[PDB]
Amino acid sequence: MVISINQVRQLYVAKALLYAKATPSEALAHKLVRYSVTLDADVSATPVAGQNYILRLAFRQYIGLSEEDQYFKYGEVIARSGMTASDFYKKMAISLAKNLENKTESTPLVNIYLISAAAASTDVPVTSATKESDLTATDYNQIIIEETEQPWVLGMMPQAFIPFTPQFLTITVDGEDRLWGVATVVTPTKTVPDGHLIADLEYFCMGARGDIYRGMGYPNIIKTTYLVDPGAVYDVLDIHYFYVQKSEKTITLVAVDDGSHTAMNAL
Amino acid sequence: MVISINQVRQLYVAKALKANTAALTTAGDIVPKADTAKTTLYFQSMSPAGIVASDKINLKHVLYAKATPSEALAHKLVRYSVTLDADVSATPVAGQNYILRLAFRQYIGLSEEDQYFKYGEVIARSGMTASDFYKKMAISLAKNLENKTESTPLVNIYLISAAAASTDVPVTSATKESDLTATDYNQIIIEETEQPWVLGMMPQAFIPFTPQFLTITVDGEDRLWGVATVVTPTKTVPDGHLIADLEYFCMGARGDIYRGMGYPNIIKTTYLVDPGAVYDVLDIHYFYTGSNESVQKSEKTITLVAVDDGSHTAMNALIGAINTASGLTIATL
Amino acid sequence: MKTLRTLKISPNAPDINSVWLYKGTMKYFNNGEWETIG
């Protein structure tokens, strides 16, 4: 994608062997935002048997670039007389997954998980194909709604994300209308790797030395071999130097990360 | 019952299998004839007015040959088990009206837009249990559905006792609840019935159905009171009303197309299918190609039906006579 | 669900959409019965 340059940036791939500083791959991984949705104990710890429980997700940057491009997806479950707290979180995570993670939606929006009380660190995935028979446990204490990695085309569609905000409608408690839940940003668990951010960076910074007209006029082009695999994770070195008036310059060196920081600690 | 054809289709009833042309003496006899080179197969049979041969099947120009048992062609009647929804209430809540709408979808007309609805209603009482609900529900359903002076029967109603659990308790309009004495009823089975049939004029057709429930006010909540699931079928409509219609059509490709029309001035065809007997069907589908430029195929089939008693005796002997004459490899059902 | 807008003081029973008041016991018609409040 197009980046802001300090008059140049040139990327060289280290596939085999002012300031200079190496960036690890954990630093360039976008930690996907998690929201934890519960029933607040101020209103009730039990679903009120007559009410409609509706959750609104308020997305931003849906298709355009602005926070005025707002997308609203809804989950709903009407409570019953014998509904427990775990029957509520099961039936809403089914209802959120049918609206958000179905077959028809043009883009991925969010991931929906159900945390069990016995397995607090293990999140079970819920999709639109998931039925109520698969969610067999009777101890569900929260619902986790987590961001997704959007589709990515090399140099034509950059890595960008759709932020969201789980919001709640009002249920009637004792003749007064109160919000039914609490959303909390817990610490993130799973990230997005570096392979899609470096391969677009290498797509851009190699036009600094070579073809700027990439595929314009397709039968008459100069095809350039790119040396970054988007399925890996890369550690990034970044040397910023210059040349009366300075002309500042940048070199970016990428190398594959096998989990320890070898080949960039070897550079 | 008009059927589709790829091209012309001929049927031959195999009521007895012989081994020579000379043994054909009674109406319904058949013998598969062939060469010693196995390049031509035909079926000599005894018509009700003499010996008649079939078409000559080129044994190089066969497309498929398959034999269908009787139980493959037996229609399984659809059963629906109506129970009280345990999430709503497993016992009838007092003073509520329990109405059930059976939605028929292919009533007299031929489309899904010709629909019909029959209702059953029970107002629950203070001490009414689940079994006393299913008793009064099935008495009310059979009173509406199975009146004697209806035009056609629609569905059959059957209680099930929870002690028996596999024997259907038939409920009709003449049935009183003095006859229904069991105290452990757990479901109401609603099962579709076999419509009337006239050969050629009225085909074998069925009116499908779904039970639907109106809502009751349980705890201030309008909840629909029951669930209706489809249990496995336990009855079958036999093959006999389907093959006699398959013979009534295929006796105009050989015989007369004008069946009955200017009534005393007709040829009357004798049909060798007993409609109260099951049959097995064999479809030998083949074609003809001409000499030089007439290479378009005339894809036709010759049907053979044999009455079978449990184990398929008469068809497997028919196939065994065809397989040794033709050199074919028709599989034996 | 069912709203009642009257309260009736009578030894006899009122109409079923009314509250039965008699000397210190309050009743109301629910589920086909006059249900004592107390």
UniProtKB/Swiss-Prot annotation, chain A:
GO cellular component: viral capsid, decoration
Compartments, record wording: Virion
Keyword Transmembrane tagged: no
Keywords annotated in UniProt: Capsid decoration protein, Capsid protein, Virion
Chief place of localization: virion
Region (FD): 30-192
Domain notes: The central region FD is structurally similar to Helicobacter pylori flagellar cap protein FliD.
Function: Auxiliary capsid protein that forms an outer layer on the major capsid protein protrusions.
SUBUNIT field: Interacts (via FD region) with the major capsid protein.
Protein name: Auxiliary capsid protein
From Swiss-Prot, chain C:
Compartments where found: Virion
Domain of life of the native organism: Viruses
Subcellular location, principal: virion
GO biological process: symbiont entry into host cell; virion attachment to host cell
UniProt keyword annotation of Plastid present: no
GO cellular component, one term: virion component
Keywords assigned by UniProt, alphabetized: Host-virus interaction, Viral attachment to host cell, Virion, Virus entry into host cell
Region forming the signal peptide: none
Protein task: Forms short fibers at the surface of the viral capsid.
Assembly and interaction partners: Homotrimer. Interacts with the major capsid protein.
Protein name: Head fiber trimeric protein
Annotated source species: Bacteroides phage crAss001
Full-sequence range covered: 1 to 38 of 97
